[PDB]
Design a protein around this ligand. Structure first.
Ligand SMILES: CC[C@@]1(C)CC(=O)NC1=O
Ligand SMILES: [Zn+2]
Length: 105
Protein backbone atom coordinates (compact mmCIF):
# COMPACT_ATOMS: atom_id res chain seq x y z
CA UNK A 1 0.00 0.00 0.00
CA UNK A 2 2.19 2.82 -1.29
CA UNK A 3 0.29 4.63 -4.09
CA UNK A 4 -3.07 6.33 -4.12
CA UNK A 5 -5.53 5.92 -6.94
CA UNK A 6 -8.90 7.50 -7.61
CA UNK A 7 -11.42 5.35 -5.82
CA UNK A 8 -14.02 5.77 -8.59
CA UNK A 9 -11.92 4.81 -11.62
CA UNK A 10 -8.35 3.80 -10.61
CA UNK A 11 -6.46 6.77 -12.06
CA UNK A 12 -3.03 7.08 -10.40
CA UNK A 13 -2.98 10.24 -8.27
CA UNK A 14 -0.28 10.30 -5.60
CA UNK A 15 2.09 8.31 -3.41
CA UNK A 16 2.54 7.76 0.31
CA UNK A 17 6.13 9.04 -0.14
CA UNK A 18 4.64 12.41 -1.11
CA UNK A 19 2.61 13.00 2.07
CA UNK A 20 3.26 16.49 3.49
CA UNK A 21 2.91 17.22 7.21
CA UNK A 22 1.35 20.78 7.01
CA UNK A 23 1.27 22.33 10.49
CA UNK A 24 2.73 19.12 11.94
CA UNK A 25 0.21 16.66 10.46
CA UNK A 26 -0.57 15.30 7.01
CA UNK A 27 -4.22 14.84 8.13
CA UNK A 28 -6.58 17.82 8.56
CA UNK A 29 -10.25 17.31 9.34
CA UNK A 30 -12.13 20.32 8.02
CA UNK A 31 -15.58 21.63 7.07
CA UNK A 32 -16.78 23.65 4.12
CA UNK A 33 -19.55 26.30 4.24
CA UNK A 34 -22.14 23.66 3.26
CA UNK A 35 -21.17 21.80 6.44
CA UNK A 36 -19.55 18.82 4.72
CA UNK A 37 -16.70 17.32 6.72
CA UNK A 38 -13.60 16.29 4.80
CA UNK A 39 -10.62 14.32 6.01
CA UNK A 40 -7.96 15.99 3.94
CA UNK A 41 -4.53 14.42 3.47
CA UNK A 42 -1.84 16.87 2.32
CA UNK A 43 0.56 15.86 -0.45
CA UNK A 44 3.53 17.80 -1.85
CA UNK A 45 2.81 16.37 -5.29
CA UNK A 46 0.04 14.69 -7.28
CA UNK A 47 -0.70 13.73 -10.83
CA UNK A 48 -3.66 12.64 -12.96
CA UNK A 49 -5.85 15.51 -11.73
CA UNK A 50 -7.51 18.33 -13.59
CA UNK A 51 -7.51 21.72 -11.82
CA UNK A 52 -10.61 23.81 -12.46
CA UNK A 53 -11.00 27.58 -12.55
CA UNK A 54 -8.71 30.23 -11.14
CA UNK A 55 -7.38 30.25 -7.57
CA UNK A 56 -9.48 31.69 -4.74
CA UNK A 57 -8.54 32.65 -1.16
CA UNK A 58 -12.19 32.53 0.05
CA UNK A 59 -12.72 30.20 3.04
CA UNK A 60 -9.22 28.70 2.64
CA UNK A 61 -8.43 26.12 5.29
CA UNK A 62 -4.73 26.89 5.00
CA UNK A 63 -3.59 30.37 5.83
CA UNK A 64 -1.86 32.25 2.98
CA UNK A 65 -3.00 29.74 0.37
CA UNK A 66 -5.50 30.06 -2.45
CA UNK A 67 -7.34 26.98 -3.68
CA UNK A 68 -8.49 25.53 -6.96
CA UNK A 69 -10.77 22.50 -7.21
CA UNK A 70 -8.96 19.31 -8.20
CA UNK A 71 -10.92 16.69 -10.13
CA UNK A 72 -9.78 13.26 -11.20
CA UNK A 73 -8.52 13.91 -14.74
CA UNK A 74 -9.95 10.62 -15.93
CA UNK A 75 -13.45 10.39 -14.38
CA UNK A 76 -14.11 13.89 -13.05
CA UNK A 77 -14.58 12.77 -9.43
CA UNK A 78 -13.89 15.61 -6.98
CA UNK A 79 -10.69 14.48 -5.26
CA UNK A 80 -9.62 17.65 -3.44
CA UNK A 81 -7.93 21.00 -3.99
CA UNK A 82 -4.64 22.37 -5.21
CA UNK A 83 -3.17 25.10 -2.98
CA UNK A 84 -0.88 27.89 -4.15
CA UNK A 85 0.20 31.47 -3.52
CA UNK A 86 1.63 30.60 -0.06
CA UNK A 87 5.02 30.04 1.51
CA UNK A 88 7.12 26.98 2.43
CA UNK A 89 5.83 25.35 0.36
CA UNK A 90 4.42 27.70 -2.27
CA UNK A 91 2.05 24.94 -3.43
CA UNK A 92 0.60 21.54 -2.33
CA UNK A 93 -2.46 19.28 -2.68
CA UNK A 94 -5.18 18.64 -0.14
CA UNK A 95 -6.86 15.40 -1.18
CA UNK A 96 -9.94 13.77 0.29
CA UNK A 97 -8.78 10.54 1.90
CA UNK A 98 -11.98 8.48 1.47
CA UNK A 99 -12.01 9.33 -2.28
CA UNK A 100 -8.68 7.58 -2.82
CA UNK A 101 -7.78 3.92 -2.80
CA UNK A 102 -4.38 2.88 -1.45
CA UNK A 103 -2.39 -0.06 -2.79
CA UNK A 104 0.83 -1.44 -4.26
CA UNK A 105 2.94 0.56 -6.79
C1 LIG B 1 -15.09 26.68 -0.20
C2 LIG B 1 -13.71 26.15 -0.52
C3 LIG B 1 -13.23 25.00 0.36
C4 LIG B 1 -14.13 23.81 0.13
C5 LIG B 1 -11.73 24.71 0.13
C6 LIG B 1 -11.06 25.30 1.36
O1 LIG B 1 -9.85 25.33 1.56
N1 LIG B 1 -11.93 25.74 2.16
C7 LIG B 1 -13.19 25.42 1.81
O2 LIG B 1 -14.16 25.44 2.55
ZN1 LIG C 1 -11.35 8.95 -11.24
Amino acid sequence: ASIFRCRQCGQTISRRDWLLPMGGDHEHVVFNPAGMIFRVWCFSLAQGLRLIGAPSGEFSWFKGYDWTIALCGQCGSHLGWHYEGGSQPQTFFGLIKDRLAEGPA
